[PDB]
């Protein structure tokens, strides 16, 4: 437990530590190989996002049972590259950062699974599958979005979701030009044991060449032996996932609906509007599985493989709500990731042979600022679990979408080989860390 | 070494790790007590400040040989309390935050060395001295400013620098009303072996009561045996510091001059003005010692005490230049702090019995955002060590000064008891860690 231990008005009362940690940390250091690796990504979940979500949902002196309970912690860098010159670009997008940890190569903003020369590099999922490990790719975004797509697709622009855009924007990747295909075509070739998220929209496009030309991508997936589930009940009813019968979960046309709702932040919103209590998203239905449900089911089905498994889990809309200057949307998706981390840690503690890693692809806009601030951007006051007011601020864009930020951010881990996230590391180290933990050549 | 290992455009080339760190970290976990503690504080130096300075002066794949070199890393929370309600205040000031790590109790914004009931608590420096340890307090700020003051003074408001203001703003602390005195009077009573910094102006005020009534505080300090020095030559000439001959360095009227200058960030500054190259401060005379030179001399003199020592060093003007939306001033003082951390780590590695800690009191406003951003606040484009353009942004205040921010931020450590900074901790845990490290009761 790392909650405040007592009365925070008294000496010692706000300590998170009960005593010396050296021996416990010593025991947390395990050099043996990992049998399984679970990587959980909060898109845009920098330290500010964690801190704001903790303050709101757990209180300042509270504790995230998942996100905050991983004992080995460091900071890593996620800068990308300018495509033409190869020099650093200090603020990455989602595609170049995912490429970094899935392949170990830096690349340009928007690239998926290729380097600045447009050369494809093998991903951690492809390597694990080549060694006979089971593989899983779970997200609350559309499955074609950068973060899950990077594990399975190699294209020159993250926009190349299906055949139609790929033909126009990634012509060397287009199937009718001899390429590997759109992101969705390449997903279906990669064939993870378990693929769960949104993005049904693109599966109604039809292939332009190949053995399944004329068919919709959904028809292709059906014909190639995928079992398709579409809601929480059908997901719960799945009992196996394998290369013979891979599980594909398509739970929404686009991204799946976020959990919480609130007003967008506004100019002088902390001043001229009352404090906010987050409420449920009315678009959110219980027929749609939560991130925790798909994480627990993925772990269940992947753990039947005797050689072990690799699973990536993305809480994807932390970032997208941060872009839209919506603190309630953003915080809710961070609470949502915490519930998934809890599922991974619960499995990993009883298993004893699982490396769990929790981090973000890059940092984002939101800032915690004083309640009486007069700021030039969008702000909002929130009623927290402490019974106090917190103000969040989005101050780095005058356009519709807030910007990513370049700050280094927390990476945390539990289990074998977790020591390799401590100190200052780079996002491309994370690839090598998971390759080595799983003993992959 | 944690710089990128090779050509950042190639696979593996941006990695900061050369191999598995499990065994190396296990060796870094030391359980024995510490003989000495060096705490280095970057005022306002959150993860964003660290990253921006590294990008600028070392390159994105570079490595701060001090700041980035400490192997045990965590994130800690620094929220303060509302004075009336005792609930969390999610964005602290310098005074409450310093009180937290110097006394182990949370307090209200503006308080020094007292709790929300205005009652005093003993500091790590007072406890060290009482146990027989040598003590030192070094800052580039006025010695009356919140960060150094917290080690030696207990006053209901940080404004109470000298007698004049204490009588008006802190009447219960004023000497003539039976209090323990202004910050400067309490400093002289506290009598560290080594106190170095700015703030000579307040020493020209005269005490209103006491044994030194009618004398200036500078006159009082001479009368009580302090050895006063005022430039680099007189500092380097000092051969010892003790309770019989405590060393008092007053190197500036107010704050010590910053190392670097540049233009203030401005509205659309990254669009409408060319990128900036920071230049050294032309007003900074060579006779003014640097933070690194004060640090090394403090260690030299404090290490003569066989029982051990406690030393706090602050790079104070990171925060001040952050407030002023001045990236060059801000980055210069981070580079400055890195040189002082090098001095501490070089001593600590040969000594073997020294805990070194590097962190901040709270986070700040500056963000790294995309080069082509159109932001509502103040921005600036900078030419970096990489030959690429960085943009920094101050978007959280329309007032004359930018606001602190509430995000958790990095704490890193080296040497005995350093494991107690790993994971999620609280700023008040740092007090306990330092206290336990030194076996203080
Ligand atoms: Mg994403
Ligand atoms: Mg300070
Ligand atoms: Zn992203
Ligand atoms: Zn984004
Ligand atoms: Zn401060
Ligand atoms: Zn400040």
Q: Which residue has the tokens 């196996």?
A: A240
Contact A43, A316 (CB under 8 A): yes
Domain residue ranges in chain B: 21-439
For residue A419, the chain B residues in CB contact (below 8 A) are 20-22, 25-26
Backbone angles phi, psi at B97, to 5 degrees: -65, -45
**Helical (H) or strand (E) element with B98:** helix B94-103
Q: What is the DSSP letter of B67?
A: G
Of A350, A315, A404, the closest CA to residue A39 belongs to: A315
* Residue A276 bridge partners (DSSP): A382
Nearest CA in chain A to B93: A370
As given in the structure block, the two tokens for residue A88 are 């650093």
Dist. CA A410–CA A22, nearest whole Å: 21
Q: Which residue has the tokens 């287009």?
A: A174
Burial class (CB in 10 A: 0-12, 13-18, 19+), B192: buried
Region for A247 from its dihedrals, namely left if φ exceeds 0, alpha if ψ lies in -120 to 50, beta otherwise: beta
Of B142, B126, B237, B239, the closest CA to residue B191 belongs to: B126
For residue B395, the chain A residues in CB contact (below 8 A) are 367, 375-377, 393, 395-396
DSSP helix, strand, coil percent of chain B (3-state; round to 5): 30, 20, 45
Do residue A424 and residue B73 have CB atoms under 8 angstroms apart?
A: yes
Do residue A423 and residue B70 have CB atoms under 8 angstroms apart?
A: yes
Backbone angles phi, psi at A287, to 5 degrees: -65, -20
Region for B325 from its dihedrals, namely left if φ exceeds 0, alpha if ψ lies in -120 to 50, beta otherwise: left
Of A168, A167, A139, A171, the closest CA to residue A152 belongs to: A139
Contact B382, B432 (CB under 8 A): no
SS3 B197: strand
SS3 A324: coil
Backbone angles phi, psi at A368, to 5 degrees: -90, 120
Contact A359, A339 (CB under 8 A): no
Dist. CA A54–CA A439, nearest whole Å: 36
Strand duo B354-360 + B367-369: pairing: unpaired
Of B42, B78, B2, B3, the closest CA to residue B291 belongs to: B42
B121 assigned binding-site residue: no
Of A182, A121, A222, the closest CA to residue A431 belongs to: A121
Which residue of the set A94, A97, A182, A317 is catalytic? A94
Ranges assigned E (strand) in B43-178: 72-77, 80-81, 88-89, 134-142
In CATH, the architecture of A21-439 is 3-Layer(aba) Sandwich (3.40)
Question: Cα–chain-centroid distance for residue A103?
Answer: 16
Q: CB-based contacts of A339: which residues, under 8 Å, 6+ apart?
A: A66, A290, A291, A292
Helix ranges (DSSP H) in A59-212? 94-103, 124-130, 146-149, 163-169, 183-190
Strand duo A260-261 + A279-280: pairing: antiparallel
Which residue pairs from B338-341 have beta carbons closer than 8 angstroms and sit at least 24 positions apart in sequence?
Answer: B338/B53, B338/B64, B338/B65, B338/B66, B338/B67, B339/B66, B339/B290, B339/B291, B339/B292, B340/B40, B340/B66, B340/B291, B340/B292, B340/B294, B340/B295, B340/B313, B340/B315, B341/B40, B341/B64, B341/B66, B341/B67, B341/B69, B341/B70
Q: What is the dihedral of CA A121, A125, A127, A130, to 10 degrees?
A: -130
Dist. CA B305–CA A105, nearest whole Å: 51
Backbone angles phi, psi at B436, to 5 degrees: -65, -40
Dist. CA B59–CA B49, nearest whole Å: 14
**Helical (H) or strand (E) element with A386:** none
> Nearest CA of chain B to the CA of A296: how many Å?
25
Q: CB-based contacts of B130: which residues, under 8 Å, 6+ apart?
A: none
Q: What is the DSSP letter of A256?
A: P
Contact B191, B243 (CB under 8 A): yes
Burial class (CB in 10 A: 0-12, 13-18, 19+), A238: middle
Do residue B432 and residue A12 have CB atoms under 8 angstroms apart?
A: yes
Do residue B105 and residue A404 have CB atoms under 8 angstroms apart?
A: no
* Residue A295 bridge partners (DSSP): none
Residue length, chain B? Answer: 441
* Elucidation method: X-ray
Dist. CA B157–CA B169, nearest whole Å: 7
Strand duo A409-414 + A354-359: pairing: antiparallel
Contact B106, B262 (CB under 8 A): no
Dist. CA B126–CA B348, nearest whole Å: 23
Interface test with A, best of B84, B90, B116 (most A CBs within 10 A): B90
**Helical (H) or strand (E) element with B51:** helix B47-58
Dist. CA B371–CA B379, nearest whole Å: 10
Å from CA of B249 to ligand 3 middle: 49
For residue B409, the chain A residues in CB contact (below 8 A) are 47
For residue B367, the chain A residues in CB contact (below 8 A) are 365, 367, 395-396, 405-407
Measured between alpha carbons, how far is residue A396 from residues B65, B264, B373, B435 in Å? 31, 17, 8, 41
Rg for chain B (alpha carbons), in Å?
A: 21
As given in the structure block, the two tokens for residue B343 are 């001095």
Rg for chain A (alpha carbons), in Å?
A: 21
Nearest CA in chain A to B63: A424
Dist. CA A438–CA A419, nearest whole Å: 15
Interface test with B, best of A80, A83, A325, A396 (most B CBs within 10 A): A396
SS3 B206: strand
As given in the structure block, the two tokens for residue A13 are 């009362």
Dist. CA B406–CA A162, nearest whole Å: 42
Ranges assigned E (strand) in A207-353: 227-229, 247-250, 260-261, 279-280, 309-315
Resolution in A: 2.0
Do residue A88 and residue B388 have CB atoms under 8 angstroms apart?
A: yes
As given in the structure block, the two tokens for residue B244 are 């019989």
Contact A327, A52 (CB under 8 A): yes
Backbone angles phi, psi at A392, to 5 degrees: -115, 145
Å from CA of A44 to ligand 4 middle: 6
Å from CA of A43 to ligand 3 middle: 5
Q: CB-based contacts of B419: which residues, under 8 Å, 6+ apart?
A: A20, A21, A22, A25, A26, B29, B72
State the first-to-last Cα distance of chain B, in angstroms, to the nearest integer. Answer: 37
Directed axis angle between helix B124-131 and helix B183-190, to 10°? 20
CB atoms closer than 10 angstroms to residue A120: 15
Q: CB-based contacts of B306: which residues, under 8 Å, 6+ apart?
A: none
Burial class (CB in 10 A: 0-12, 13-18, 19+), B211: exposed
Contact B60, A90 (CB under 8 A): yes
Dist. CA A367–CA B110, nearest whole Å: 22
Dist. CA A361–CA A46, nearest whole Å: 9
Q: Which residue has the tokens 């009352």?
A: A274
Region for B76 from its dihedrals, namely left if φ exceeds 0, alpha if ψ lies in -120 to 50, beta otherwise: beta
Do residue B86 and residue A410 have CB atoms under 8 angstroms apart?
A: no
Directed axis angle between helix B291-302 and helix B327-351, to 10°? 20
CB atoms closer than 10 angstroms to residue A58: 20
Q: What is the dihedral of CA A86, A90, A96, A97, to 10 degrees?
A: 130
Known catalytic residue at A94: yes
For residue B13, the chain A residues in CB contact (below 8 A) are 105-106
Contact B36, B355 (CB under 8 A): yes
Which sign, positive or negative, has the C-alpha torsion A194, A196, A199, A203? positive
Q: CB-based contacts of A348: which residues, under 8 Å, 6+ apart?
A: A36, A38, A354, A355, A356, A414, A415
> Nearest CA of chain A to the CA of B374: how many Å?
6
Measured between alpha carbons, how far is residue A420 from residues A345, B54, B211 in Å? 18, 21, 59
SS3 B320: helix
Return the biggest CA–CA distance within chain B.
Answer: 71
């Amino acid at each position: 437990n790392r909650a405040a231990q007592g009365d925070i008005t008294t000496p010692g009362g706000a300590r998170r530590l009960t005593g010396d940690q050296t021996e416990a940390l010593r025991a947390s250091l395990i050099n043996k190989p990992a049998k399984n690796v679970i990587l959980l990504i909060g898109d845009g979940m920098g330290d500010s996002e964690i801190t704001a979500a903790r303050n709101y949902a757990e209180g300042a002196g509270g504790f995230f049972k998942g996100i905050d309970a991983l004992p080995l912690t460091g900071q890593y860098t996620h800068y990308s590259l300018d495509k033409k010159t190869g020099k650093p670009d200090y603020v990455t997008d989602s595609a170049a950062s995912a490429t970094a940890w899935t392949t170990g190569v830096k690349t340009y903003n928007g690239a998926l699974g290729v380097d600045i020369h447009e050369n494809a590099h093998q991903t951690i999922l492809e390597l694990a599958k080549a060694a006979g490990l089971a593989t899983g790719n779970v997200s609350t975004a559309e499955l074609q979005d950068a973060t899950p797509a990077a594990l399975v697709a190699h294209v020159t622009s993250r926009k190349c979701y299906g055949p139609t855009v790929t033909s126009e924007k990634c012509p060397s990747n287009a199937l009718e030009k001899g390429g590997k295909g759109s992101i969705t075509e390449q997903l279906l070739n990669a064939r993870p044991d378990v693929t769960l998220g949104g993005g049904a929209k693109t599966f109604a496009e039809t292939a332009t060449a190949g053995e399944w030309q004329g068919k919709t991508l959904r028809e292709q997936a059906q014909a190639r032996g995928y079992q398709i589930v579409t809601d929480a009940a059908s997901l719960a009813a799945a009992t196996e996932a394998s290369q013979d019968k891979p599980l594909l979960g398509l739970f929404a046309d686009g991204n799946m609906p976020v959990r919480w709702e609130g007003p967008k932040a506004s100019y002088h919103g902390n001043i001229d509007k009352p404090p906010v209590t987050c409420t449920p998203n009315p678009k959110r239905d219980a027929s749609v599985p939560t991130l925790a449900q798909m994480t627990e089911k993925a772990i269940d089905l992947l753990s039947r493989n005797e050689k072990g498994f690799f699973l990536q889990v993305e809480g994807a809309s932390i970032d997208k709500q941060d872009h839209a200057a919506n603190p309630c949307g953003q915080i809710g998706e961070t609470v949502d990731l915490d519930e998934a981390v809890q599922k991974a840690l619960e499995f990993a503690r009883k298993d004893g042979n699982t490396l769990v890693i929790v981090t973000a692809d890059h940092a984002h806009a939101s800032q915690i600022i004083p309640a009486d601030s007069k700021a030039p951007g969008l702000t909002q006051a929130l009623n927290t679990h402490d019974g106090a007011v917190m103000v969040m601020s989005y101050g780095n864009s005058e356009e519709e979408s807030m910007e990513h930020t370049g700050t280094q951010l927390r990476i945390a881990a539990y289990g074998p080989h977790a020591a390799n996230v401590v100190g200052l590391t780079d996002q491309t180290d994370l690839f090598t860390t998971m390759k080595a933990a799983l003993s992959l050549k």
